[PDB]
Amino acid sequence: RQMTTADFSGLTKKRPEKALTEALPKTGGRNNRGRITSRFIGGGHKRLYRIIDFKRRDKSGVNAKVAAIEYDPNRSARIALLHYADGEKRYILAPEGLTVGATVNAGPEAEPKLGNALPLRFVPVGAVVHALELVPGKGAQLARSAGTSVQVQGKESDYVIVRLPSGELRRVHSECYATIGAVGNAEHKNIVLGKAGRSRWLGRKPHQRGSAMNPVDHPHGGGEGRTGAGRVPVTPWGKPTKGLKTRRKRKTSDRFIVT
Amino acid sequence: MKRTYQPNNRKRAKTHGFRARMKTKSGRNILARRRAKGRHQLTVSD
RNA sequence: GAUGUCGGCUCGUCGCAUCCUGGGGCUGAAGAAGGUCCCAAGGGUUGGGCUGUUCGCCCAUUAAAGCGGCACGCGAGCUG
RNA sequence: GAAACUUGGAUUUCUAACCUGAAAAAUCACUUUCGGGGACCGUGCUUGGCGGGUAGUUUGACUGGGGCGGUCGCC
RNA sequence: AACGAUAAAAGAAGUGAGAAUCUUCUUCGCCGUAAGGACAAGGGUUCCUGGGGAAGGGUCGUCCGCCCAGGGAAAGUCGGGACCUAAGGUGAGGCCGAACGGCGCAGCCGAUGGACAGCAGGUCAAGAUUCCUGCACCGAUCAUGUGGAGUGAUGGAGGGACGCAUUACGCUAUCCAAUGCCAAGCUAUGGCUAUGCUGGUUGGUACGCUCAAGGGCGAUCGGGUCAGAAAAUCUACCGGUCACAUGCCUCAGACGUAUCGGGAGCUUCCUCGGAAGCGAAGUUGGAAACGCGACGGUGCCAAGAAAAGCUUCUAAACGUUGAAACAUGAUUGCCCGUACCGCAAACCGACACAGGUGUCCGAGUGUCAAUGCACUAAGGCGCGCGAGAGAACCCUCGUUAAGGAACUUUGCAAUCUCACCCCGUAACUUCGGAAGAAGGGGUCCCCACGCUUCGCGUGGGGCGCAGUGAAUAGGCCCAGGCGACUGUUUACCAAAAUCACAGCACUCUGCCAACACGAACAGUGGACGUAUAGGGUGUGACGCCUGCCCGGUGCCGGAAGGUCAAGUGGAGCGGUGCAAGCUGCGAAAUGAAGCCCCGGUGAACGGCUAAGGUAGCGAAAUUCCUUGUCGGGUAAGUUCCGACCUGCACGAAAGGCGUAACGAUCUGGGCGCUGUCUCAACGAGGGACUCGGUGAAAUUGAAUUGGCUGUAAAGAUGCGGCCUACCCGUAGCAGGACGAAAAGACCCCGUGGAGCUUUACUAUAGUCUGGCAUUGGGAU
RNA sequence: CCCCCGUGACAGGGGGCGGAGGACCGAACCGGUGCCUGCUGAAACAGUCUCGGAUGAGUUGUGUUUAGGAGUGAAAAGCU
RNA sequence: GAAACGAUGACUGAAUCCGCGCGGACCACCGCGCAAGGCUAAAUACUCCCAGUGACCGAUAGCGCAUAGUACCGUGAGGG
Ligand SMILES: [Mg+2]
Ligand SMILES: [Mg+2]
Ligand SMILES: [Mg+2]
Ligand SMILES: [Mg+2]
Ligand SMILES: [Mg+2]
Ligand SMILES: [Mg+2]
Ligand SMILES: [Mg+2]
Ligand SMILES: [Mg+2]
Ligand SMILES: [Mg+2]
Ligand SMILES: [Mg+2]
Ligand SMILES: [Mg+2]
Ligand SMILES: [Mg+2]
Ligand SMILES: [Mg+2]
Ligand SMILES: [Mg+2]
Ligand SMILES: [Mg+2]
Ligand SMILES: [Mg+2]
Ligand SMILES: [Mg+2]
Ligand SMILES: [Mg+2]
Ligand SMILES: [Mg+2]
Ligand SMILES: [Mg+2]
Ligand SMILES: [Mg+2]
Ligand SMILES: [Mg+2]
Ligand SMILES: [Mg+2]
Ligand SMILES: [Mg+2]
Ligand SMILES: [Mg+2]
Ligand SMILES: [Mg+2]
Ligand SMILES: [Mg+2]
Ligand SMILES: [Mg+2]
Ligand SMILES: [Mg+2]
Ligand SMILES: [Mg+2]
Ligand SMILES: [Mg+2]
Ligand SMILES: [Mg+2]
Ligand SMILES: [Mg+2]
Ligand SMILES: [Mg+2]
Ligand SMILES: [Mg+2]
Ligand SMILES: [Mg+2]
Ligand SMILES: [Mg+2]
Ligand SMILES: [Mg+2]
Ligand SMILES: [Mg+2]
Ligand SMILES: [Mg+2]
Ligand SMILES: [Mg+2]
Ligand SMILES: [Mg+2]
Ligand SMILES: [Mg+2]
Ligand SMILES: [Mg+2]
Ligand SMILES: [Mg+2]
């Protein structure tokens, strides 16, 4: 769903369940000491951080009930505020179809039902999960985003195959946790973003094409009128395919990375 | 015609200060150098 | 260790290889109207459209709408 | 032709190096209960490769101005 | 030349050696969303008093922000500190590093923010929630009485706690009206005789059964331990019983009563002008915040600090007999700032500078509204040369016959238009717009009737050339080019058609991610993000759309082979020694990533031999010839529109062709108006001129510095010849003095420089790769 | 959101109401479009007139952080 | 370079007295020395300061200063 109109815009999103409740402050910044390292990003409106439970282990064997499903900035992911029988309230990112006031059990013996958050060896094949723990313990580095999913494929010994959103297949051992279902935030992607400055509500001041800069500034800089040569960034690497990975440990846990 | 100098005591003193020259040794060099230039006068008193 | 460049505007001034006017000779000049050559520099030699344009083409006129010089006259005068 | 005191190589795998995460102790430190990775990675020395990302420089003369064209020695 | 804004002065009185300039008086003019007032910065005695007059002051000076001396600055409650924390800074241990040093958990520093006890008045020449007077408030220690018991941690909790827009109700600040009150007196000019005119018309505290909008409020019993390290009576949850109207709770503020203030003025001595005393009434009606009641209500996405004080709970501890708590006096109250300037003569601008400087207050009348606009209160000010003159010229203005853009690069500039109400309004459209299209009417006064109010509606009457009667105040339209759009950019010649922009595409990156800062197996940014994410690159809303060519360059993929380094390794070759031996060059094999080799790749570099332009457009921001050819407009059209096509040298994301809207964009046209023009005139003001005061600058070989013509280094006052020409100034003009300015920026030269580029040379950060260590065991 | 009409390949349309906007006119403020003036200036970049933004990609104070092959840059080789 | 010798960053890793290193590829011979442990006056350099002296200055000289790192310029280093 979206808003639609005339007066010069397109497509805002729409949300239920509103609270404004309980976690740490965050503070915007771009440069890191001297010259800005991660480029642009100097704008933005005043976000706060929400501590979110990726690990979800020590709550093992303990059921919970969804309080509400809340909007969080810095996210693109619906978050469900969980409350446990323990009394402990914990923010857990909300998947598609996860209702308000549903009940989500934690722990390994919990059924592959929505949100139930179990390890892979107990997850029946083909099933869809999100928030995938990479190395047992720690937390989920995989599929934390909107509409992003992972599909379990037949395991090995302690190890399982998974199809990540990129399409790449990964070896990930079954000792790792995961959450059942895919994390929607509906379809975030088709938001229109309207006009500029909206891109500025959040990140800041997007691409400055090197081709308008000067020979001193960028490789693309210089000349008379709009043109090209080369094909390359801040430093001469290029737009198109150059494998940027280094030959490494991880690389033996990847089977058919394609796209 | 907003000019360059905007007197601000705290600024002036927090850059340029005796304390501020203590912070570093390029500073401490300045200090000894000046002491040597003959009793000059110094950074905070001005 | 600088003589500011095109064109316009302003202001003129000079040469005559005379566009007009004046005086003549010849005419394949009856008259009227011309052609051409000589004498002649006093004065006069219009207003617009196009173009940065000088030039040039066009409009409407005129006795005629001359050609050139003056640092392609003139920016310690203007424009730009 | 078997046995071994054996030596290097590729494979495979292992845990005591090492890396790395959680745990009451925000970075560390730890007896640590552990978990994953792992002789890899990293790292130091060397070998060859790439490298306007950066750096130092080079880019002649004659010439009825310079350039272009041409011409530099020899008979 | 100038004396620093064209806001403006005049007279009298005074002081004095001397007055246009200092003082007093009375007028005038100027500001008044300030040119008034209050802070913060910053500046330092610039404040006040008494002197002074060199210099500073653009003149003058008796005067000053100047010089001399003397005084003035007062805090438990305001702001800061003994309180807290943000970004950032620092940082024991800790992590890195040729040195110096770079990082970094806790902790500590750091207001721009959180927390926190006072208000009303009075007055020194100069201070004021600071002193004084009135009543008040906070904490702390002690003392008396109650109580007669628990208190409550470097620890838990709750709380502090946070956005934007818009908006209901009730106030107050505060302003307005009056035949309300109060107070003073007069009045004349023609009138009025008060119903006129002028002024004032309440601030704090306490009490109170009075009026009162609005504001927010649940409570205990209890269950699980897996929750807050443990604890806990506390907090989260879960469950049970009493929260559908109530209603406990709170008063903004009003009202009353009292009290302390204040109040117009009146009195009184006056030592040249103040001081002391006295003290009138406070009414009805209306307007009203951005302040208060509040942490109100509603909607929205872009999702809106932390920590301490604060409240609650225990651990430990002391005591449970003298507790905590209350109030009753008492005692106690540290440090710093506090004058004055503070949109400016006191701060930044070299200056007493037309510049700049964050916040708060900022009255009245008229005006739909308002911080606009005119005038004006309070308050402040006439800008520290002045006086005449009424030439040229210049600047800033007012009016202009007839004409009306003929001016000219161009309507540049300057008119015209101008608010509000009504009627009315196009092609085209993305259905919002275009649009304030265009156009037409209205507008003042009085009276009458009507409504819903500041007022409006209707009718009639009136007055002037004119009724947004003055000030504020859009000219419009038709076509194109470019970019869609709001926006951004060359501080000081370029605001655009540049840049960015949502949207689109290619590609990279699986998380100690790619990428980037960096002595660094440190740390950090990416990101407390995880492929619907992040980096890079190019296009550039939306609409249809995006063709052919990979031979070369790159990038991705490939393995049969061609070469390929060290290196493990040593046949062989040669030296020396009598000799064992010791030694020099050093190869076949083993050798990786590269490169040659193959295949793919274009919203990759790219091209129209690898192919040769698919749409669509075309003399175009691309066009040479060229003012192309026809046509439109014009009396006349190198520009402009339309075709056509012969495209010198358009073309599909360095996008192709369109597109409503947008534009201080560029181009052509038309309407209107008009000093732009025919072609200029008159008028104003401020300079120019004259007199008195103060008094610069660039420049300058020296000068007793003419014309013609000729010569001369080839543009003569300075040489020749001839002509002209008494001495010296003032106002003016701009031809010469190759006039001034800056050792030409163009050009060339220098085996001069620097920025940039790349398939120029050479290295190199980075990065790839074999071997060697760190580096171990077991199987085949 | 609340009323009425309407759904034949068609969407909607009207009234109430609401209070949206890189909306509009316009002071403050931010900005510099065009002319003139100034040009040994009042001023080492202004003045008058005119013009742009004017709830946003907005303006502004304080505190801090980033710099010499370096920073910063809605991109001029601009600023430091 | 025919490059010995010393010196380390990486990697290997010896002998020891009929032993070891050197004598400028290397070998034999002949000589010279005994590393991988330490400490150590004097002659040597300098002039903030003090003394004496001068074919050194004498007020645009001599230190920048006949005293001043002051006045003054700058945010600052700095300059003067
Ligand atoms: Mg550029
Ligand atoms: Mg480059
Ligand atoms: Mg380029
Ligand atoms: Mg000269
Ligand atoms: Mg003749
Ligand atoms: Mg000529
Ligand atoms: Mg000429
Ligand atoms: Mg020009
Ligand atoms: Mg170079
Ligand atoms: Mg004068
Ligand atoms: Mg003056
Ligand atoms: Mg005074
Ligand atoms: Mg004097
Ligand atoms: Mg004087
Ligand atoms: Mg009255
Ligand atoms: Mg009378
Ligand atoms: Mg009255
Ligand atoms: Mg004061
Ligand atoms: Mg001033
Ligand atoms: Mg300002
Ligand atoms: Mg007001
Ligand atoms: Mg007003
Ligand atoms: Mg005004
Ligand atoms: Mg005068
Ligand atoms: Mg006229
Ligand atoms: Mg008349
Ligand atoms: Mg007329
Ligand atoms: Mg003309
Ligand atoms: Mg105009
Ligand atoms: Mg009449
Ligand atoms: Mg106007
Ligand atoms: Mg634009
Ligand atoms: Mg500029
Ligand atoms: Mg400009
Ligand atoms: Mg614009
Ligand atoms: Mg005079
Ligand atoms: Mg002579
Ligand atoms: Mg002569
Ligand atoms: Mg002149
Ligand atoms: Mg000259
Ligand atoms: Mg020169
Ligand atoms: Mg707007
Ligand atoms: Mg050696
Ligand atoms: Mg002397
Ligand atoms: Mg001297």
Short mmCIF file of C-alpha atoms (C1' of nucleotides) in Angstrom, two decimals, chain E residues 106-359:
data_model
loop_
_atom_site.label_atom_id
_atom_site.label_comp_id
_atom_site.label_asym_id
_atom_site.label_seq_id
_atom_site.Cartn_x
_atom_site.Cartn_y
_atom_site.Cartn_z
"C1'" A E 106 35.78 2.02 32.61
"C1'" G E 107 36.47 6.82 34.87
"C1'" C E 108 37.12 12.17 34.55
"C1'" C E 109 36.87 17.00 31.80
"C1'" G E 110 33.36 19.55 28.64
"C1'" A E 111 26.62 24.30 28.05
"C1'" U E 112 25.09 25.40 23.47
"C1'" G E 113 21.23 21.40 27.03
"C1'" G E 114 19.18 18.74 32.43
"C1'" A E 115 18.76 20.18 37.76
"C1'" C E 116 17.78 24.13 41.30
"C1'" A E 117 15.24 28.59 47.21
"C1'" G E 118 12.12 35.60 46.15
"C1'" C E 119 8.74 38.74 45.05
"C1'" A E 120 7.02 44.24 45.61
"C1'" G E 121 9.03 48.89 46.03
"C1'" G E 122 12.71 52.63 47.36
"C1'" U E 123 16.91 55.50 46.24
"C1'" C E 124 24.19 57.52 45.59
"C1'" A E 125 26.33 62.20 40.85
"C1'" A E 126 27.64 57.05 39.47
"C1'" G E 127 25.16 49.88 41.89
"C1'" A E 128 20.75 46.87 42.12
"C1'" U E 129 15.86 39.86 42.28
"C1'" U E 130 23.05 42.50 45.04
"C1'" C E 131 22.11 48.04 49.29
"C1'" C E 132 17.64 49.77 52.13
"C1'" U E 133 12.34 48.89 53.69
"C1'" G E 134 8.11 45.23 53.51
"C1'" C E 135 6.76 40.56 54.01
"C1'" A E 136 9.03 35.74 51.91
"C1'" C E 137 11.65 31.25 50.56
"C1'" C E 138 15.87 26.78 50.38
"C1'" G E 139 19.28 23.77 52.64
"C1'" A E 140 22.59 22.89 56.68
"C1'" U E 141 24.11 22.26 62.31
"C1'" C E 142 22.15 22.71 67.20
"C1'" A E 143 18.45 23.40 70.95
"C1'" U E 144 12.69 22.37 72.90
"C1'" G E 145 8.09 19.43 72.27
"C1'" U E 146 5.62 15.28 69.41
"C1'" G E 147 7.17 10.84 67.84
"C1'" G E 148 7.98 7.10 70.57
"C1'" A E 149 10.18 3.85 65.76
"C1'" G E 150 13.88 2.17 61.76
"C1'" U E 151 17.21 4.56 58.69
"C1'" G E 152 17.60 3.87 53.81
"C1'" A E 153 23.66 2.22 49.74
"C1'" U E 154 29.66 3.12 44.76
"C1'" G E 155 23.64 -1.53 43.93
"C1'" G E 156 17.73 -2.59 41.29
"C1'" A E 157 13.63 -0.07 39.74
"C1'" G E 158 10.41 3.90 38.33
"C1'" G E 159 11.23 8.77 36.75
"C1'" G E 160 13.71 12.71 34.57
"C1'" A E 161 12.29 11.73 28.64
"C1'" C E 162 12.29 15.21 24.66
"C1'" G E 163 9.80 15.43 16.80
"C1'" C E 164 7.19 18.25 13.14
"C1'" A E 165 2.56 20.43 11.45
"C1'" U E 166 -2.22 21.89 12.74
"C1'" U E 167 -6.01 23.01 16.36
"C1'" A E 168 -10.62 23.35 20.86
"C1'" C E 169 -11.67 25.56 25.39
"C1'" G E 170 -10.43 29.37 29.70
"C1'" C E 171 -7.33 33.19 30.99
"C1'" U E 172 -3.57 37.05 31.78
"C1'" A E 173 0.17 40.31 29.93
"C1'" U E 174 -1.76 44.18 27.24
"C1'" C E 175 -4.37 47.73 24.24
"C1'" C E 176 -9.01 50.41 23.09
"C1'" A E 177 -13.99 53.12 23.96
"C1'" A E 178 -16.96 56.09 27.21
"C1'" U E 179 -21.79 61.72 29.69
"C1'" G E 180 -17.98 55.68 35.05
"C1'" C E 181 -14.70 57.66 38.80
"C1'" C E 182 -10.83 60.94 40.28
"C1'" A E 183 -7.82 65.38 39.89
"C1'" A E 184 -6.08 70.50 37.90
"C1'" G E 185 -7.60 74.75 36.01
"C1'" C E 186 -8.98 77.59 31.88
"C1'" U E 187 -11.67 79.51 28.96
"C1'" A E 188 -11.19 84.14 24.70
"C1'" U E 189 -9.85 83.53 18.46
"C1'" G E 190 -16.60 82.93 15.19
"C1'" G E 191 -18.43 79.27 18.67
"C1'" C E 192 -18.36 76.11 23.15
"C1'" U E 193 -18.96 77.51 29.10
"C1'" A E 194 -19.45 71.54 29.98
"C1'" U E 195 -21.78 66.90 27.75
"C1'" G E 196 -15.91 70.79 26.69
"C1'" C E 197 -10.32 70.27 27.02
"C1'" U E 198 -6.06 67.69 29.89
"C1'" G E 199 -4.12 63.81 33.11
"C1'" G E 200 -4.43 59.37 36.25
"C1'" U E 201 -7.53 55.08 36.62
"C1'" U E 202 -3.56 49.62 40.46
"C1'" G E 203 1.44 46.26 41.92
"C1'" G E 204 2.90 42.27 45.82
"C1'" U E 205 1.45 39.13 50.00
"C1'" A E 206 -2.09 36.50 53.28
"C1'" C E 207 -6.63 34.69 54.30
"C1'" G E 208 -11.30 33.21 52.32
"C1'" C E 209 -17.41 28.25 52.70
"C1'" U E 210 -17.32 33.03 46.32
"C1'" C E 211 -16.95 32.34 40.50
"C1'" A E 212 -13.84 29.05 37.34
"C1'" A E 213 -12.24 26.85 31.96
"C1'" G E 214 -8.55 23.57 31.62
"C1'" G E 215 -5.32 19.94 33.27
"C1'" G E 216 -4.48 13.34 34.90
"C1'" C E 217 -5.90 9.72 38.03
"C1'" G E 218 -6.39 3.97 38.95
"C1'" A E 219 -6.13 0.06 43.63
"C1'" U E 220 -5.05 -3.85 46.51
"C1'" C E 221 -4.92 -9.32 47.25
"C1'" G E 222 -1.90 -12.25 44.36
"C1'" G E 223 1.31 -16.58 40.74
"C1'" G E 224 5.73 -18.15 38.51
"C1'" U E 225 10.63 -18.31 38.92
"C1'" C E 226 13.19 -19.13 33.76
"C1'" A E 227 13.26 -11.68 34.34
"C1'" G E 228 15.96 -6.75 36.49
"C1'" A E 229 24.13 -10.17 38.99
"C1'" A E 230 21.84 -11.91 44.20
"C1'" A E 231 18.45 -9.37 46.96
"C1'" A E 232 13.73 -6.67 47.51
"C1'" U E 233 7.76 -5.10 50.56
"C1'" C E 234 10.14 -2.63 44.71
"C1'" U E 235 9.67 -2.90 38.78
"C1'" A E 236 8.04 -6.21 34.33
"C1'" C E 237 4.56 -9.96 33.28
"C1'" C E 238 0.55 -13.18 34.11
"C1'" G E 239 -4.29 -13.92 36.76
"C1'" G E 240 -8.63 -12.40 40.44
"C1'" U E 241 -11.63 -8.70 42.47
"C1'" C E 242 -13.80 -2.80 42.80
"C1'" A E 243 -12.21 1.55 37.56
"C1'" C E 244 -19.40 1.98 31.60
"C1'" A E 245 -21.76 8.94 34.05
"C1'" U E 246 -19.18 9.63 38.40
"C1'" G E 247 -15.49 11.18 41.01
"C1'" C E 248 -11.47 11.83 44.49
"C1'" C E 249 -6.71 15.39 42.82
"C1'" U E 250 -5.25 20.55 40.94
"C1'" C E 251 -6.05 25.18 40.75
"C1'" A E 252 -4.34 29.17 35.45
"C1'" G E 253 -7.11 33.16 36.41
"C1'" A E 254 -11.07 36.03 38.19
"C1'" C E 255 -13.71 37.82 42.73
"C1'" G E 256 -13.87 39.23 47.81
"C1'" U E 257 -11.53 41.04 52.50
"C1'" A E 258 -7.16 42.92 54.57
"C1'" U E 259 -2.41 44.61 54.23
"C1'" C E 260 2.22 46.54 52.27
"C1'" G E 261 3.21 49.33 48.03
"C1'" G E 262 2.48 52.60 44.20
"C1'" G E 263 -0.55 56.60 41.99
"C1'" A E 264 -2.03 62.21 38.90
"C1'" G E 265 -0.84 65.87 41.39
"C1'" C E 266 -0.74 69.21 45.59
"C1'" U E 267 2.56 71.29 49.54
"C1'" U E 268 6.88 73.39 51.20
"C1'" C E 269 12.74 75.60 51.80
"C1'" C E 270 15.23 76.39 47.35
"C1'" U E 271 21.95 77.30 48.38
"C1'" C E 272 20.14 78.82 40.49
"C1'" G E 273 17.64 74.23 40.71
"C1'" G E 274 16.69 70.00 43.35
"C1'" A E 275 15.43 68.02 48.10
"C1'" A E 276 11.81 66.61 51.98
"C1'" G E 277 6.35 66.07 53.01
"C1'" C E 278 1.26 65.00 51.47
"C1'" G E 279 -1.48 61.87 48.66
"C1'" A E 280 -7.34 61.61 44.66
"C1'" A E 281 -9.94 56.69 42.34
"C1'" G E 282 -9.16 52.44 40.76
"C1'" U E 283 -15.81 51.80 37.14
"C1'" U E 284 -18.63 49.46 33.03
"C1'" G E 285 -17.94 47.58 28.07
"C1'" G E 286 -14.72 45.53 24.22
"C1'" A E 287 -9.85 43.36 21.86
"C1'" A E 288 -5.76 39.80 22.88
"C1'" A E 289 -0.31 36.46 22.42
"C1'" C E 290 4.24 32.94 20.25
"C1'" G E 291 3.03 34.04 27.71
"C1'" C E 292 0.04 30.97 31.43
"C1'" G E 293 -3.86 26.70 32.52
"C1'" A E 294 -1.22 21.73 30.50
"C1'" C E 295 3.21 16.93 29.84
"C1'" G E 296 -4.45 19.64 26.16
"C1'" G E 297 -6.58 17.53 21.09
"C1'" U E 298 -5.95 15.72 16.21
"C1'" G E 299 -3.22 14.31 12.09
"C1'" C E 300 1.80 12.94 9.94
"C1'" C E 301 6.67 10.13 8.75
"C1'" A E 302 11.36 11.57 7.76
"C1'" A E 303 10.11 8.39 13.95
"C1'" G E 304 12.03 12.55 17.14
"C1'" A E 305 19.89 13.31 23.46
"C1'" A E 306 22.29 11.51 27.83
"C1'" A E 307 23.29 11.67 32.73
"C1'" A E 308 22.45 13.66 37.88
"C1'" G E 309 18.95 15.69 41.26
"C1'" C E 310 13.93 13.20 42.12
"C1'" U E 311 10.53 8.71 43.82
"C1'" U E 312 10.47 3.65 45.19
"C1'" C E 313 13.57 -1.33 47.04
"C1'" U E 314 16.74 -3.88 49.50
"C1'" A E 315 22.52 -5.63 50.41
"C1'" A E 316 25.99 -3.93 54.19
"C1'" A E 317 26.00 -1.20 58.51
"C1'" C E 318 24.36 1.20 63.17
"C1'" G E 319 20.17 1.07 66.22
"C1'" U E 320 15.71 -1.48 67.59
"C1'" U E 321 15.42 2.67 75.01
"C1'" G E 322 17.63 8.02 72.74
"C1'" A E 323 14.81 6.41 64.94
"C1'" A E 324 12.49 8.51 60.69
"C1'" A E 325 9.48 12.49 59.93
"C1'" C E 326 7.00 17.03 61.44
"C1'" A E 327 7.45 22.73 63.41
"C1'" U E 328 10.00 25.86 67.12
"C1'" G E 329 13.31 29.16 67.64
"C1'" A E 330 18.24 29.63 67.04
"C1'" U E 331 22.65 29.71 64.19
"C1'" U E 332 24.45 29.48 59.31
"C1'" G E 333 25.05 31.04 53.97
"C1'" C E 334 31.88 30.18 50.52
"C1'" C E 335 33.97 31.39 45.24
"C1'" C E 336 33.36 34.21 40.65
"C1'" G E 337 30.55 37.75 37.43
"C1'" U E 338 27.56 42.40 38.43
"C1'" A E 339 30.23 49.99 36.36
"C1'" C E 340 29.76 51.63 31.10
"C1'" C E 341 29.41 50.61 25.54
"C1'" G E 342 26.66 46.87 23.60
"C1'" C E 343 22.77 46.98 15.37
"C1'" A E 344 27.45 50.65 17.61
"C1'" A E 345 31.85 57.23 17.91
"C1'" A E 346 33.09 52.19 23.00
"C1'" C E 347 32.58 44.93 19.44
"C1'" C E 348 35.02 42.94 13.96
"C1'" G E 349 36.17 46.54 9.76
"C1'" A E 350 44.00 50.86 10.30
"C1'" C E 351 40.05 55.08 10.80
"C1'" A E 352 34.46 59.25 15.72
"C1'" C E 353 34.17 54.15 8.49
"C1'" A E 354 26.83 54.51 4.61
"C1'" G E 355 29.83 47.54 6.00
"C1'" G E 356 29.05 43.44 9.52
"C1'" U E 357 27.10 41.35 14.67
"C1'" G E 358 23.21 35.92 18.03
"C1'" U E 359 18.56 36.62 21.34
#
